[model samples]
Target: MEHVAFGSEDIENTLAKMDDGQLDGLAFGAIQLDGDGNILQYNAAEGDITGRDPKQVIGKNFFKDVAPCTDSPEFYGKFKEGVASGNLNTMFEYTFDYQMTPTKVKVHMKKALSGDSYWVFVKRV
Candidate 1:
């Protein structure tokens, strides 16, 4: 992934502003999606995974990105299946590369609001 500088203070401040502790020290990839699956907010980890900066990816169409495998049918298909079945909670072993040992990661999908946006939080166990 291409190196991109983000305000760690900004991230920390945002986390501090949140009253809930569920998000503390949670370092992972986050992506915001529209109803049509366009990429919105790709977090720092995700940007690192995709070899691109969030600034360059935020508004870009994800289906076209030649980055990590998230933009591919394999991962996206499972995501669509999970969301479609009303089973927003999902966990699976995802390996972006065959040579790289797979990590046990969970994909959490949620809609930000009605007709607003969708947020996806991913983390490794």
Candidate 2:
């Protein structure tokens, strides 16, 4: 099995090979979205961590509906850049302070090795 730890090398390919059941086993939040930012797979850990129901979030526009805060230039900008241009393997730290308490998180966004799928992995920081 491919190691899915944070900062692991070649993770884009790792995610590409992982099945839905395997993705659900991720320790951190691993949300898979299409080029248009529609949520494709919101894993179990994601729901458990954020209290956001995966079933309800699937098929929703990730930036516009789910996390409107990320629609900004800094975050969404990179996502846009990746989908159109080439492979995306970027990592950064961010804070979520919408209606809930501010929580720091380490984030990584990578365009999967196959298809138009993009994976956003988040770890509590």
Candidate 3:
């Protein structure tokens, strides 16, 4: 069976290595964004945690349309730095509150080794 725990270094590495289906098998939420923060990948676990339909967010902007809750300085600012710098590896904890009940999650944002996309991996607390 394919399994990877939250906080595992292998998680990010595995994400870069694997493609679509297997990403859903992970316990944590996996969201991939393009250089402009457009949602490129949204896995099933993310949908379950945020009460969002994965379908509605595929082509949307993550820091804008998908989750405005993260549009602030602490969240979006860090991500912006990553975009400008061409390297993003940030890990922190934050609560999600906007349209849904506030939910705490561990957040890890990283640039894939493949170097094409950025990822935001979340684990509910």
Candidate 4:
């Protein structure tokens, strides 16, 4: 069975420490987005899982362009709510059907405590 590991580090702190190249080396999918949901950084793990090119994903709108499946009240809605409320650290078990096959995943949404950036950490479940 696959598992989720955020190391012994907090998600925001860890991401703040790494550049895009370093994030690409992670074992799980890590997507960093702006407040508008534009994909600012897409890791190698996510590229492999979604079968999409990193070049294509970067600069695209994550919820609308890359994965419309998450453009709903359940997914994108929660992200918006978090950003609006200034506390956006939340996780849930979700299934994605955007590419490849329908896959089960654990989804974590985190907002930077002081910035307009957010992260979406996904682990296959």
Candidate 5:
């Protein structure tokens, strides 16, 4: 599958228009989170990428349970900052190695203009 470029605004724009039904068909992983960092939507692509079942992750705390690899100043810290600031649009490449095998991927955290929720887009890099 073709992957979105790391930190691409094009992908960000596309994500802004996608609804829950459209997310399942994306080539990369797409997860939605509440302002509190709760996993509100865990798509199938994320399940394939992380080897995690969507059922197990839905409603879980993302940084603490589902993906602790992001529970640091760089990842989770920025998320909290964004929520508080109301300007959460961040993108970077990170390596995942906690509770799973290490793998490099592009991580994008975005807050929809209309809600208090955030969307995380992950593409293998």
Candidate 6:
């Protein structure tokens, strides 16, 4: 029930109909972050995927608390490179242990500007 499970056209229509509740149901994290990477939105699908309560995550620095696995120097170094190059989007796939199961994840990240800063949209499969 988290993802729309729809085609591109249907997704557009769903987005057009979105209220706060609908937006919160998206399957991916769909985090809205400031340029400094402070989180402003924590959707329900994210809560489910991460096994965390939304209230525990809101206002927390996303990379810091929500996904500390990305905090290594190597990851940050690459992130800085991407930012400097204005790459703005990246797609990757990896495997990790989730609960007791090994899970494979495909992730895409894109940056969108709402004003002078940026927001990150993440999709996972």
**lDDT of the structure predicted as candidate 3:** 0.86
**TM-score per candidate, in order?**
0.55, 0.89, 0.92, 0.89, 0.85, 0.64
lDDT of 6: 0.54
Judged by whole-model lDDT over C-alpha atoms, candidate 5 comes out at: 0.82
lDDT of 2: 0.83
lDDT of 6 at 39: 69
Best model number under TM-score = 3
Query: How high is the lDDT of residue 40 in model 2?
Result: 91
With a 3 Å backbone cut-off (N, CA, C), the pairs that clash in candidate 2 are none
Tens digits of lDDT, candidate 6, 1-125: 55564223234334545554766877665555555567666667666666768767667776666666656544434455555665555556644343424455554444443442233334455
- Model 6 CA RMSD to the hidden true structure, in angstroms: 4.5
Q: Give the Å shift of residue 110 in candidate 3.
A: 0.6
Q: What C-alpha lDDT values do all the predictions have?
A: 0.53, 0.83, 0.86, 0.82, 0.82, 0.54
User: Which of candidates 1 and 4 is the stronger one according to lDDT?
Assistant: 4
Candidate 4 Cα RMSD after full superposition onto the native fold (Å): 3.1
lDDT of 5 at 48: 87
Give per-model CA RMSD: 8.4, 1.9, 1.4, 3.1, 2.6, 4.5
Candidate 5 lDDT score at position 76: 97
Candidate 5 lDDT, tens digit per residue, 1-125?
A: 34444456666566667666677777778888998899988878888889998878899999988888899999999999999998888889999887678989998888864588888888888
Summed backbone clashes in each candidate are 1, 0, 0, 0, 0, 0
Q: Give candidate 5's error at residue 82 in angstroms.
A: 0.3
lDDT per residue as tens, model 3, 44-101: 8999999988878899998888799999998999999998899888899999987999
